[PDB]
């Protein structure tokens, strides 16, 4: 019954092909609700969920200003990190920032986060106390020093423990039919021979929300984790998710294998069997 709001921002330098590409998106749990793309015509923060559309002009003007301000900061950051790492003008680099807050079933604060990455790797992140920083190499220590001198953690903490949770609750209320739902997975297993001595057993979960799910195979009750191909949970495109897990088994042994499904919409975890 637990929820989260997260904003994700990516900027990519493109030396000689314009100013950096900037993309921003916001989510409540697994549902996207807003986006911004610097290469789009509108130059506005735009709705991506029907329940956010009701926010008035002040909201959209305000979110547009903020997201443009984020974009400008990341543009500066790209030049700064080049200097910190002594990198050349010519190559393309990526900065990513994500932040947000988590609340429990009662919608009270659990934790917040605010993290940054340069070229695919941790750079700097607020620690769980929201008062100090973890800096992942020496360039990030420079950033820590400047951010500590500027009292950045204090204003981030006021947002993460206050504003962030307050807007999350508002979204959860306004978007309740979409966001407070739980759709339990529809499960089945398929069987296809891959030769006359081996068969693929694939355990499927379809049409579920939220995205979080566990799929496992057992053989005589022993977990088969090293032998299981597990795909990334994937969007169906309609607001729900899909996932499967497969094992290749000697023909004749099917009845030894069971698939186990855990999801918050199930009243009990499921066990699917071949007998």
């Amino acid at each position: 019954g637990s929820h989260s709001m997260r904003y994700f921002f990516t900027s990519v330098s493109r030396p000689g092909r314009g100013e950096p590409r900037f993309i921003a998106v916001g989510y409540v749990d697994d549902t996207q609700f807003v986006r911004f793309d610097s290469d789009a015509a509108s130059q506005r923060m735009e709705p991506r969920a029907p329940w956010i559309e009701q926010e008035g002009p002040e909201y959209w003007d305000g979110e547009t200003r903020k997201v443009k301000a984020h974009s400008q900061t990341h543009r500066v950051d790209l030049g700064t990190l080049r200097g910190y790492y002594n990198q050349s003008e010519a190559g393309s680099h990526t900065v990513q920032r994500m932040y947000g807050c988590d609340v429990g079933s009662d919608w009270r604060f659990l934790r917040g986060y605010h993290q940054y990455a340069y070229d695919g790797k941790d750079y700097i992140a607020l620690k769980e106390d929201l008062r100090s920083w973890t800096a992942a190499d020496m360039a990030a220590q420079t950033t820590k020093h400047k951010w500590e001198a500027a009292h950045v953690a204090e204003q981030l903490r006021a947002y993460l423990e206050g504003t962030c949770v307050e807007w999350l609750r508002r979204y959860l209320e306004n978007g309740k039919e979409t966001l407070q739902r739980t759709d339990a997975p529809k499960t089945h297993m398929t069987h296809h021979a891959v030769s006359d001595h081996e068969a693929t057993l694939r355990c499927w979960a379809l049409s579920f929300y939220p995205a979080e799910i566990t799929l496992t195979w057992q053989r005589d009750g022993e977990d088969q984790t090293q032998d299981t191909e597990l795909v990334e949970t994937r969007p169906a495109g309609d607001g729900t998710f899909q996932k499967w897990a497969a094992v290749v088994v000697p023909s004749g042994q099917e009845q030894r294998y069971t698939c186990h499904v855990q999801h918050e919409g199930l009243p009990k975890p499921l066990t699917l069997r071949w007998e």
Binding site: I23, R48, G120
Partner: protein, 100 residues
């Protein structure tokens, strides 16, 4: 630099039934850096009316994207997703297999 290969999945939104309109998805996840080319194919030809999701990333910073188009499955027509990325020496083609 860090480079991470796209994990590619091609599938329909709903269980596919010949003659019944549906949506064809190509979900690419787990990649880095973010520049990627993804086409949906019908009998090897690029489908031009394809839409895609806004770029986002997972907890480990790797990117994901969903490309999608409306389609009506038949017995004869073959569908695929073609993906290129810096980690791939040539485009990777993954065929839609409805019998998974």
């Amino acid at each position: 630099m860090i480079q991470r290969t796209p994990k590619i999945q091609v599938y329909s939104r709903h269980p596919a039934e010949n003659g019944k309109s549906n949506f064809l998805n190509c979900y690419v996840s787990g990649f880095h850096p973010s520049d990627i080319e993804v086409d949906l194919l019908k009998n090897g030809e690029r489908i031009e009316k394809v839409e895609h999701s806004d770029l986002s990333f997972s907890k480990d910073w790797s990117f994901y994207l969903l490309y999608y188009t409306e389609f009506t499955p038949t017995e004869k027509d073959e569908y695929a997703c073609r993906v290129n990325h810096v980690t791939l020496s040539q485009p990777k083609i993954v065929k839609w297999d409805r019998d998974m």
